[model samples]
Structures are given as C-alpha cells and as structure tokens.
Target: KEMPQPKTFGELKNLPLLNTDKPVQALMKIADELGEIFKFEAPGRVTRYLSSQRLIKEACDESRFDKNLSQALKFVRDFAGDGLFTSWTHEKNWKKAHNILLPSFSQQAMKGYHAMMVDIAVQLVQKWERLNADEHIEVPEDMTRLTLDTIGLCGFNYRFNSFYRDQPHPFITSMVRALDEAMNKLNKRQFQEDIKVMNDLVDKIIADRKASGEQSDDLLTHMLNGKDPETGEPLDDENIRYQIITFLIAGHETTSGLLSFALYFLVKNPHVLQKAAEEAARVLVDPVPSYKQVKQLKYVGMVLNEALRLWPTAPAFSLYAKEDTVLGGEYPLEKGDELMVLIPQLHRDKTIWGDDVEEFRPERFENPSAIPQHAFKPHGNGQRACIGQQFALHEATLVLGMMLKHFDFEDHTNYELDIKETLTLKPEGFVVKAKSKKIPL
Candidate 1:
C-alpha cells in the first residue's frame, strides 16, 4: 500500500507524525507514503530522513570513520544537562569516560548484579501470584517497578524497593517530572527543582560511600575509583552524579519498556509464547537461572530481539556530519548536516526483513547472519552502541524464563497496541490476566 504523497516542511510539520497519540505509527505511515528518503527543509534548518535498510546500514558504518559525526541534537544534550549523554562532551570527556566505564559493564562486572535482578523478578512473580487468575495486571506499571528496583540496586547500590510501596519513590516521581518538563519545554524552575531532588539523592549516596570508606562491587564503586586514562584525573562529584543519573534513567527506561512490550507480543501470539515457554521450561528448570543457564535460552533472546524490532523504546536518534561527507554513498552531507535514523521504519523495511515484517516471528533472529549488519540494531551501532546490551538481554531473558515457567498470560484487552510516548515508548492501557502455572503438591 502506498502512503500519501510527500509534503513540504511546513505542510509535513502539520501532519499526524508531528502531533498524534501514536507518534511512532504516524512516522511509519509517513515513511510508507513518502518512500525511503524524505527531505524536509525549513528556515535555518535542513534535515534528511532515511528509512532504507541498505542506506541505514551504510550510514551507521560510515559513522565509524568520523568520530566527530557522533554529535547528538542540542535539546537532547540540554536534557542530559552536564552528563555523559551531553553531545558537547562527546569529543572531550565522553571518550575518556566511555573507556573508564567499559569494564564496569563487562561480563565479570555484570555477574554480580544477576542475583539482585533475580530477587526483584521473584518479587514481581509474587505480586502477580497475589492477584486472582481473572484479574488484569497493568503491565507497564509493574514492569517499571521491577526495573526501577533492579537499576536502583545494580546501578547505584541504592534500593527504591518500588514494588513494596504503593506510592512511587519521591526520587522516581521527581525524575519523571523533570524529564517530562524538559521534553515539553515547560517551566524551567520546576524542572530544575526536580533535577535538584535527583542530584541530592546521588550526593547523599556518594557522601555515605565516602563516610563509610567501605568498598563494594557495584557500578557506583567502579565509578568512584575509575580514572580517565587520558587526563589521569578522577571524576568530580558533579560528573559522577551525571553518570549515575544517565545510567539510572537510560538503563531502566529501555529495559522496562522492552519487558512490557515483549510480554504484550508474547500474550498476543500464543504459539510464540508456548514455544518460548517450552524453551524456558526445558532450559531453565530451576526457578532462578544462573548466568550460564540464562545464556542457553536462545529462543527467549530471539523473542526479545523481535519485540525490540517492533517497538524500540527510543525509536529514532539523530547524528550530524562533522565535515563534508557523503551519506549512503550518494547523498552529499556537508558539515553540520543532520540525519535521523528511523529505527521502527528501518526495522519494518520489507526489503531487509522480508514481506512479513509486521508479524511477530522470533525465528527471524535464529539466523541473524542472514541479515545485513547495522540493519537490526535495537540498541545502536559502532562505538556509541549500548554498553548495557548484554546486561539488559540477560535480565530480560531471566524475567521471561521465570515468569513463563510459573504463569500463563492471557490478553485482557483486544488486539490493540495502545501506546503512550514520554521519553520512552510505553504500552499504555496494556493489561493481561496471568494464570498461575504452579501445581498443588
């Protein structure tokens, strides 16, 4: 089906993509209508969009040659506000910081957090168990709680214990407000106040760590001790605070959204769910899987990859050219030219993923070598790729394995994918009735 004809910048800005309840699907509609490469020019700004899988792969590959091209959007950096995610620091502090932080997410470093993740997942299961079989569970809310608790414990050595409380922790609530305000370009004062709440929380944790003079095997501990290899200087409290916030927010939002969406797809496709459960029940015989055993659940990982293909939490990201260059080997991009890589559009590209691209088929990932490089990057690509990809995959796989073994999910809502877009794409109004799989003794 052909999409509507392309429109000019002013005209396109007024389209549903710019303002809609389902912004992602809106973008997809526009992309479908306008073809793979859409060019939009407004006063003082010119941007080109690419949804072709081939071109996107080439563009991401080209990103490696020019490190300076990794510049993010201005508002994005402003939203990050003096943190590692800030675009201005990409050339200066980000490189050094990335090096220092590399080992912190290593397999060795990530192993310590597994038990903590399993503990939180168990709490999630217990919560579900308490609910009657016919009761519908609000997925995003509970998934957020599980991930918040996981990140709090694993990322910062702090515990939100989100599931235990009816009300969200003040820090989590403030963080959300700060992000919402920043995204909406709302009142700066309120945003700053919210930010201060987060800063103070990190400050207290750092202060307690120093006052105790005790060492622990956590990301925070590694950050406190890690040094910039280039400058040979320790990160100041302010920078440390920024890293903590970046990890805490970025880490949890993506993973939690992934879990919510993944479960939705699983329940919607019972055969896939049954296959996934079979894989889990076979490999993860124990309630809590060890790191080695978790790695063995190949189909479980495929389901996650497929779900990520459909609804990447952060769907699209921008990159700029640092110098005169050519994009996709044809389109000329001068210095400062911006390019937006549309994840949902590219992932749904029929030329790459085949005609049934819209379907939830985890088997597509079974032979990833069959697909082109940079075509299926749910996390990202090149050096700027997600540092916590392994960490997230492990945690998500564990949750699915445990939950599938203990409970069977039945979709409560019809086949509607109700979504709410904040900083991340969330499954709004997504609920399911979970029947206990445990048998009586």
Candidate 2:
C-alpha cells in the first residue's frame, strides 16, 4: 500500500485517532501531521478543572502538542488548591511534590548533580570495556541507566547507583518499564485504572512523609509545606499523590527522551556531532561547568532545541473545544472536536522554516526573535507553557556537554531509529557506539 497521505491538523483533529487510549502514540501521529505550531485544544473544564496543581501554571500555562499522560497528571495535580485554601497547611503538601521535586539545578546543588551523572557515565564506560572484550556491548540501553542516575541527582537527592548495581533499584526499573509501555499500549479506560494504582503508591509515599516527619528539599518537600498564607490547612492526600507522580514522571521521563533524541540526532548528523564537540571543548573549562555557564552555552542550547524540534519527546498537544471555535486561523472547529497541535510538522514546515528546514542547523535559534513568534515552538508558547523548560535546558546542557567533551561518536549503520511512541519520542533500541577521547598525559 502507498504511504498514508498526511492529513492537516485541522482535518485530523476530528478523527477518533485524536482520542488516543495511549498518550504517547497519540502525540507521534500529531507530530506527523501538525509539524510545529499545532495549537492543542481541550475542554475549558479540563484546563481549568481543578488541575490539582499549584505549579500547573508555574510549570507552563499554555499547553503543548503532546506528552506522557500518566506522568503528566502529576503536573496538573500540583495545583489542587491554587484558587482555594483548605488552609496553608494543606497547600504545603502539594507544593512539596510539585515545586521541590522539579528542581532548577541552579540551586547550590551543582556538585551533587554532576557527581551523580558523571559517576554513572564512568560506570558505563567500565561496562563498555568489559562488554567490548566479549563483543556483547549495547550503549543505548546503558545510557538509559545513566540517565536514571542523573534523574536521581537532579530530581531527588537520592542515589540509585543504577548502572553499577547488580540488581538496580526496583522503582527505577519499574518506572522505566512502565514508562516504556505507558503511552503506546494502554487505552484511556485502562490508563484510568493504571493511574489509580499510581495514586495509591503516591498516597503511601505522602503518608510516609507525614508519619516520618521527613522533610526533603526536593519538590516533595515543597508540596508538603506549600500553603495558603491566610488558611492553615494541609493539602489533601489526592493532590499530594498527584503532584508526586507528576514530579517523578516529568523530572525523570522528559530528560530521558531528550538524551535519547540528542544522541540519536548526533549519530545521524555527523556535522552536528563535530560542531557540538568543538563547542563543548571550547566552552566547558571544567568537566563540570557551573550552572551559569551551562545556561550561556548558546550553541549547545540551539543544538538541543534542534533535536527537540526534530524529535520532540513531548510530540503533540491536544485540546477540546468547550464551544465552537476557530483555531490558529480558519477551521470550523465544533464543540467536542478534539484539536491536536503537531510540533514536529510545524518545526519542519518549509514555508515557515525555509527550504532547508529538514537540515540540522542550530544557528536557526541564535536569533530567537528572528524565528516566527509561534511557528517553531518546541516548548509550547503562551501562559500554559512548560515551567520546567529551564530545568530541562540546564540538565540537557550539562549532560550533552559531558558526552560531547569525552567521546567521539560513531553511528552504527546496522542500527536505525524506530520511533516507539511512549512517555516521550523514544527510539526503539536506539543503538550507537562511542569511543572515549584519549587522555593527554
């Protein structure tokens, strides 16, 4: 059969395909349709529906084209008492899960974050040595393990010793397993059940926090402490669980997708790999650059943006009309018609991006304003955009910088990227080979 004709986001919006039972695959289809500026439409109630979050708007007010749903629920839950007050005490619990868990990395915790990530990388290198000797090495799987460790440092202050451990942390493995299948397999009905189980786990964690009097600087701490100044009540357990799940998914999953895509992009585009390495060497004075320097790494940031543009993990955004409305421009959108915003399609549009749109050019972002205002939005634009976009960027900069600084990458011709729609735009067994740069005496 001939390849399926690509439909317009406007046309595709009305199809049952939009109402995906699985969140991840839904976005992949949207990425194929909308390109870049896919303005997702959802019910006013859905958006305004007691999002159960405090940082819901803080993370991002405008919605994007797509993302991992089960994990995303946590983000919404963070705002449980935003407009109301069960009392300040209640608000605090929600804040611990939302604000604290999703750390900016700009905090004085740079040492901890770097040490953890580098340690994982070091272990991977050691594993690679052993595996290479036996000719049974797989780096992509190993990278996932490395990123898990990174998540622990940047998200929680805990050390899972993921790659190094004989039997890695159960939660880490379970979380990855759940994430791997999350957006691709289950239906919405099934997802609802899964979410219930997730909330159950979250409830247990919150209860433990209260009973142990354990206070963490991580986002969970803030969720437990955040409160309305006027009232002295604590947030409900439902909201507490909701925010914890959100931080776990957001803080962990998105970064994993970003690393996979960046590594995949570099493997595909050799020029980008060389240029990115040059930038890393020239800019990163120490193996671990300070947060400020990481922020200013413009070229590195642009490369990441390009990767995000090309293979955005959060691939699509969806919104349903509460009433008949025309979106972007003209399109007779009726009430209940779900609209999907396809980010990759818009990002790749020749009309909006230029003839060389498909080419990897990090320079496109050098002049941020020069790019169309809303056309190439990797992170959704508007009041409801990603709050942790800054955090994602920082984490990406440091991790990518380290990878580029240390290794010379070789793309495996036998290995090709198979898009596995999941919590993010994941590669199915994204495989590549990397050799460490020789250390100078």
Candidate 3:
C-alpha cells in the first residue's frame, strides 16, 4: 500500500473530514486510506493525525508526552473563558487548578456522591416505568437529562430536576448551544448570550450557597473554599464559573453517550444482552447496586468496556508539540506541530483487537491485560485523562444493573449508527422500549 503523502495546507483546508456528521466513521476511513500517521494542513499550521495505538500511547506517555493542548482545544478555553478547559493558559495556572480540583473527584470525595448517583438512576428507572410499555424513548436524550441532573447535584449541590422537566432545563439548553457555537464557526453575539446564561446561572448557585453558609462534600464547595497553597488565594468567581461550566458539561455528555451506546449495542446483540442481564440479576438482585457491588459485576463492566471500545465518546483529541519531535519513531514532527489522536481507529485496530475487532463481545475485557497498553482509551490516557471516569463507570453499571433487573430493553427504532459530533459524539435517532419483568426478589 502506498503511504499517503501529507496533504498540503491548501488541500487540507478543502477536505470534508472534520466537518461531518459521522466524524468517527470519517476518521476511521481516513486512517484506512492513509497510513496510521498522516498529516493535514490546518490554517497556517500542519496537523498530524496519530491513528496507531502504539503511536497514540507514545504521544501521551509521561516521558515523551506534551501536555500542551493544540490550538483546536482553544475552543474549549473560549467557551470556558478562564477555567482549566482553557488549555492555552500558562502551565502553572493549569497545575494550580488541577491541584485544587483533583481531590474533589478522589475516591474519598466520591463516597458522598454515590448516593446521589444511585438516586438519579432510580429516578430514571421510575420515569421509564411511567411511560407506556411499548413507547420508544430516545435513549441519548433521556440519558443526557439524567446525567445533567446527576452532575448538577454532585458537582454543585444544585438540582436541575432535568428528568422531571418536560422541557430541557435552561442551563442545559444554554450549555448545549454554547458547545455548538464553540465547536463550529462561532456566532459571536449568540455565543456571548449562551455563555452569559450559563455563567449567570452558575453565579446564582454560588451566591445562593454563600448566602446559606452551608458546607457540603461536593465539587462546588471544594472550588469555593479551596485555596492555592502557594498563593493562599481563593479562586475568583470568574475562574470558578469556568470550572463549574467545564464540569457541568463535560461530566454529563461523555457518560450519557457511553450509556446510550451501551444500550444500543445490547439491543443489537440480544445474546450479549442476555448474558449481561443474567449477570446483573445474579449480582444485583436488588434494584439498586452499591458502588462495590456494581464494581464486582465483572461481565457487566466488560460490556461497558466493549461498548466504549466500539464508540469512544470523545473520538479524537489533539496534543501540541512543544519541541521538534518524531512520531512512531519515523515521521519527523516540527515544533508547534499538532497531533490528533484518532481514538476510533486505534480502538478498532485489527492488529491489537484481533480479526473480530468489529464485533460487540464483552468477553474481550475478561483479561484486559491480554490487550496491549494504550490500545483502549475510552476516557483518554495519562494525567489529562477524565477525572470522572470512575464515577461514570460506577453510575452506568449501577443503572444498567437496576434496569436489567426489572426490564428488558428492546430496540424501538431500527437505528443505524447515526451519530452527530459536537464537542462529544451523540447517537442520533437511537430509541429503546422496555418490557417489564418479574424478578425473584
């Protein structure tokens, strides 16, 4: 196979790869056509796409990694204004923010949030019960609302009651709009309004908490009371708001996509569903599974793992080169070169996952070590990996266990892999109907 020559900057500008509905699929096709390491021109810069698993791992390694996010991630900074998502900030600032925020998502910190996570999952199950048995529900839409509500309470000790609301919550609407604006060519006026609505709502929550003088073990309190050890100064409202928005949006979208896709694949593969459901019933005979209990359901965890392998929510992310470097120990990269990690291609690589890489088999994770390192990164890798990965896993597993205990999910719509990409990958037109079952409690 002839290796694809790096696309000229002009030629890159004309490609439709980035501006597509099915971005993961598009990127996978791009990797198929071009060898794992290919380059495209981005504006005045050249962007390298790292599609091989080993190369992606090397780019993210502690010894060789560059934490400097690419110009592409500047959209996150623009939308966040002044938070950690604003990757363009000085390295010290990022370290400071990450230091203060890290403890909030620690295992100890997550203990208090577990109750809220299960409660929200219960609420979702109840909502499903109220619906007609045969009525198809939009899995992604509903899961998004549930996660929005869950993150609201867990992140800020605020309640969006998203599941109860007939219409989308104001904050959610604004956040989604802001994300859309940031991802595409921005509409300045509208983007400003969207940001304002989101920020103002967060400000109100912060102010209300201040007035109450109540302290809780939530991320909001951690952000509010946390001080920089070196400077002994508290985070200002502006930067705090940025962190709030970052957590609020990022916390939910990726997890929601994971749950939605997991359900979608389960429905498509009924035999897989039966095996997973049997495990759920055996381990989680009670509707709600504790965090420890949920973690113990090995097969259920593998199913989620396999689902994420097939459909990584954040399909690709970019890393900026601080110094001239070589990728895959072959392609020479100049300073300021941006490498985009093509997660979809890497996850489905036949070389790593074998000939059945395309199939939805949860057993692949039975012995995860059998798979090479960095071949699977649904939540990303290294220090910049998602802080909420554990939280998402526990929450999804619990919900799946509870749901399977009482109901069987049926594909309400004959849906294909119709996906739309904004800041995260979302399933389009994916719906499911649940049939109630009598569990021997």
Which consecutive 10 residues in model 3 have the weakest lDDT in total?
1-10
Output the worst ten-in-a-row residue range by lDDT, candidate 1. Answer: 64-73
Q: Count the clashes in each prediction.
A: 1, 67, 0
Q: Please tell me which predicted candidate would have the highest TM-score against the true structure.
A: 3
List the candidate 2 regions with Cα displacement exceeding 4 Å. Answer: 1-140, 165-168, 176-216, 228-234, 438-441
* Candidate that scores best on lDDT: 3
Provide the overall lDDT of each model, using Cα atoms, as 2-decimal numbers: 0.76, 0.54, 0.77
- Candidates 2 and 3: which is better by TM-score? 3
- Native-referenced Cα lDDT, model 1: 0.76
lDDT of 2 at 137: 34
Give a tens-digit lDDT track for model 3, residues 239-347: 7777888887677888889888888889899999999888887887565557667766888788889989988887787777667877766777677667778887888
Against the true structure, candidate 2 has what lDDT?
A: 0.54
TM-score per candidate: 0.92, 0.69, 0.93
Candidate 3 local Cα displacement, residue 291, angstroms: 2.5
> On a 0 to 1 TM-score scale, where does candidate 1 land against the true structure?
0.92
Task: Give candidate 3's error at residue 419 in angstroms.
Answer: 1.7
- What tens digits encode model 1's per-residue C-alpha lDDT throughout 1-441? 222235554644534345555655666787888878776554445566668887777667554332232223344344354555553435666776787888777766667888888888889988898897557788888988988888788777788989879888999988777766655541678777887788899889998997897787667888788898888877777777777787766777788899989999999899999999998888876756787888888999999999999989878766667677776565777787776778889998888888998899999999978878778877766777778887888889988878788888888657488778765787888888888877310
Off by over 4 Å in 1: 1-5, 9-17, 42-44, 62-79, 439-441
Clashing pairs in 3: none
